[PDB]
Amino acid sequence: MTEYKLVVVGAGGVGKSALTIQLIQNHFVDEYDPTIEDSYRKQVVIDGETCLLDILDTAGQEEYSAMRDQYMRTGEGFLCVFAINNTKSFEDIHHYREQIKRVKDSEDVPMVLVGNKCDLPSRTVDTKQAQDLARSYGIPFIETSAKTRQGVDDAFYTLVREIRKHKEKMSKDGKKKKKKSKTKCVIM
Numbered sequence: 001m002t003e004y005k006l007v008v009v010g011a012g013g014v015g016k017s018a019l020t021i022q023l024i025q026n027h028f029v030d031e032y033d034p035t036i037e038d039s040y041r042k043q044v045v046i047d048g049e050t051c052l053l054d055i056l057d058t059a060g061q062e063e064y065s066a067m068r069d070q071y072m073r074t075g076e077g078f079l080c081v082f083a084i085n086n087t088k089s090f091e092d093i094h095h096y097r098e099q100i101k102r103v104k105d106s107e108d109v110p111m112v113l114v115g116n117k118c119d120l121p122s123r124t125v126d127t128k129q130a131q132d133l134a135r136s137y138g139i140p141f142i143e144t145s146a147k148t149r150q151g152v153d154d155a156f157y158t159l160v161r162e163i164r165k166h167k168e169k170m171s172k173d174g175k176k177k178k179k180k181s182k183t184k185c186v187i188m
Contacts, residue, residue: 034059
């Protein structure tokens with residue numbers, strides 16, 4: 001069993017609590033709050049592989065938290081919650097993605113671009129914007145809806161698979177590899 005550590009960051013007020021609370025519970029509906037801080041730990045079996053999916057549901061009340069930084073370092077994958085009908089939502093995601101990848105290493109950090117409220121006919125972000133973000137990190141992108149309760153299903157399982165793949169590429173890459181150990185000079 002491998003603990004697949006998840007953390008939800010970026011785009012707040014969009015309905016982060018609804019997606020996470022509902023996905024874990026599926027008992028209460030029509031829940032909507034500005035931002036609810038309450039971590040949830042739910043294990044899920046993927047492709048016959050038992051793993052722990054802990055969705056770190058937190059609020060942006062204070063960016064200065066030792067625990068917040070602590071979780072980001074220990075996290076394995078990030079959920080990119082955004083509203084396709086809002087520029088700010090995906091724009092906010094980009095800022096967080098750049099900081100997270102910067103802090104940890106670079107465009108090699110596990111995460112999947114997953115939005116909500118796709119049913120609403122008011123898209124402000126085209127394929128190329130979501131595509132640009134996903135292609136930048138070399139990972140797939142998708143849109144979902146809490147109302148539909150379907151896209152989050154694919155997004156959650158897909159995220160897990162990409163995380164596993166990161167381990168695959170990283171393992172094959174090993175501690176080091178590059179093209180040449182030696183060095184050369186362009187000179188004139």
